[PDB]
Amino acid sequence: LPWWKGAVIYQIYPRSFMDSNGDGIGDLPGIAQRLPHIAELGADAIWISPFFKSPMKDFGYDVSDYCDVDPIFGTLEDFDAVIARSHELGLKVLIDQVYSHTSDDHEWFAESRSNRDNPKAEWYVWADAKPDGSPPSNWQSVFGGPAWTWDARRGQYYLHNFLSSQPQLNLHNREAQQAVLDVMRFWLERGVDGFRIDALNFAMHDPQLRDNPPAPPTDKQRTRPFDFQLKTYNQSHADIPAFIERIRALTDEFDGIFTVAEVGGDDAVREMKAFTEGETHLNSAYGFNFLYAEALTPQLVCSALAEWPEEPDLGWPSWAFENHDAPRALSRWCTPEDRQAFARLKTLLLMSLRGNAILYYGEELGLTQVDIPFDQLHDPEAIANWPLTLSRDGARTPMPWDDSECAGFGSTAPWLPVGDDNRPRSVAAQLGDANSLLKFTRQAIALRKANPALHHGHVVECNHDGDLLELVREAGGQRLRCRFNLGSKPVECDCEGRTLLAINGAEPTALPPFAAIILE
């Protein structure tokens, strides 16, 4: 019965939650003021995306000091206040930990790149050019172009799976391993309740520097060099789990800690279970099954869930429909016509999946993707790979609190725009509206919490037939039948039970368009 098993986690993007000093950017005092929103929602924890000292090339995921707060967001004083307010509200607090790379402006890299003999020479991945000047391997950056960059300081290439500004850490190096573990300890000694571990399968590359093989044609249009090749050797080294053991060993030194890993790629499930196996690795992990899905299908849900059987040493999966890395799901999965009814099907479904619900800021209000022009881009990835981008900027818009000029974000000049379609969806307006998605999400969260078959139950059946999904889950004497219509065709279901919840005119025997019902 660990607190995290069955939790809902509300992910905060601190640049766009609440700007408490009027510069156009969210900040930690902003988050402190707004925390009651999350509490009243009934989320068990917050996960704060990176707020550490950073040049902000990957907007905080390029860390230059692992143990301080960036001036953009306030101070270490302000982080201790978010922890204390959260705990007073009964919220657990998770922070992002970014261990596959640092900024190029990090003190470790400034030492590493200085020459070939320094104590940190080997904390990053250095290799000579080919005799013709070429890079040491054919590896390609996640964000466009190659995964290696020249440094004349050393007369060598250095590896970066992401921007040239995010040189890959060499976690094969036990001194680097020890250093990032000591960073995690710093954060654990400040009362943090655990971690979201960034791109954990990028922690470790192949020391042999073998070329990646060509990718088969899964004819998703190829957007960038990275899409041409299987990520065989640039990442996913067999030794990552041994490193994760030292993490769990470290978190076991403190009370009631939760770890969840982000795990990228289509090679996904094998490293997720390896990263979460038994009680020696991480608690949980999430992948991109929903983040990169064009459509929400029953077959995609029964595919995803089938990967995580209740076997005795298997991990506990986490689910993310949307976050800062993928367009707002309502802009992917449904027409404007269908949006209102779909938003509640989707929210109820997230709460009915076996695993943890990763709710992203704005998801409880039904915020839509804001289209960001090429002139107005921030994400380097998009400028490089236009028009075939990851569309992350439009996912990162300021949280709308009221219907004021600044929508209560704290700035008539925010760093990204609110979006005309998100302005009417503000938390204030939704607190006045009795059928609001804010009020529905509360209800979905309360129904998961109070029902042990939703909260944690086994998936005893997952049945898919065209647009109909049925989840049969079960725990503590309870057996629930969860029926979902992911389609605009009224579908006819043989129940013989009690309706816990019915939406969009769902009945025990019939499901109109985008209707769902939980039967006990």
Structural class: alpha/beta
Beta-strand percent range: 15-25%
Q: How many independent structural domains? A: 3
Portion of residues in helices? 10-25%
Arrangement of strands in the largest sheet: 1-2-5-9-10-11-12-13
Termini, distance in Å? Answer: 23 Å
Largest sheet: 8 strands, parallel, barrel
Number of helices: 13
Shape: globular
Please provide the count of β strands.
20
Radius of gyration: 23 Å
PDB class: hydrolase
Keywords: a-glucosidase/GH13, carbohydrate, hydrolase
Assembly: monomeric
Entry title: The a-glucosidase QsGH13 from Qipengyuania seohaensis
What does this structure look like?
This protein has three domains: 1-102 and 174-457, no CATH class; 103-173, no CATH class; 458-520, no CATH class. Helices cover 24% and strands 17% of the residues. The chain has helices at 28-41, 76-88, 107-112, 174-188, 240-251, 268-274, 298-306, 330-333, 336-352, 380-385, 427-432, 437-450, 452-455; strands at 8-12, 45-48, 52-53, 65-69, 92-97, 126-127, 148-151, 156-159, 194-197, 258-262, 284-286, 316-319, 356-360, 458-465, 468-475, 478-485, 491-492, 499-503, 510-511, 516-519. It has an eight-stranded parallel beta barrel. α7 (298-306) links the parallel β11 and β12. The radius of gyration is 23 Å and the shape is globular. The PDB classes it as hydrolase.
